[PDB]
Amino acid sequence: RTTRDDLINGNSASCADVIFIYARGSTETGNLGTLGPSIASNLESAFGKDGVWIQGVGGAYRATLGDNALPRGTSSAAIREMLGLFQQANTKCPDATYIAGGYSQGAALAAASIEDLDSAIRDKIAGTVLFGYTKNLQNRGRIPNYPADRTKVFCNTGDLVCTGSLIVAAPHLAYGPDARGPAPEFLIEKVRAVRGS
């Protein structure tokens, strides 16, 4: 449901082929929040339960609303937590293909983490999806040091956070349809592009 720690719980002897690391939005529950579960279910349908590990960013990432105002759109502690998860993935399952995603503050967190990640690990992330990307205008719709072709941003018309503000309006809470269809569609496509099938 809202909490998945497949990577942390997973046995290195039987690594999944795909590992998905996702950061929730501000004030959301568990480590997956409102959008994570929908994406997870669809990934599982495509690769099978044993074929994909779903891992939300918990630990030090409290998803505190106020942290949206910090320089990188989230806290240093949160970035350290997500970086640690990518490092864990690389250590536990070096041959798996990684994919990532984030919503709202989680999107800024995903972007910041990926930007700071060691290139060798970053290059293993086949695709990343960002919903209500708080640094969309500032970063020109990109994740620093990460290819545009592997990035997909979902920014609704009227969602003020995509336009340089921190105001939360109704369109910011309307990403349900995207998480149910195009987002997992994109991730699946990007994984198959490099892994074949």
Minimal CA–CA distance to 197: which of 54, 47, 14?
A: 47
* DSSP tag of 2: -
Active site residues: 104, 159, 172
**According to the entry, how was the structure determined?**
X-ray
Q: Are 7 and 88 in contact (CB under 8 A)?
A: yes
- With the C-alpha atoms ordered 95, 151, 3, 134, is the resulting torsion angle positive or negative? positive
All domains of the chain in start order, with CATH: 1-197 (3.40.50.1820)
User: Could you give the CA distance from residue 187 to residue 181 in angstroms, rounded to a whole number?
Assistant: 10
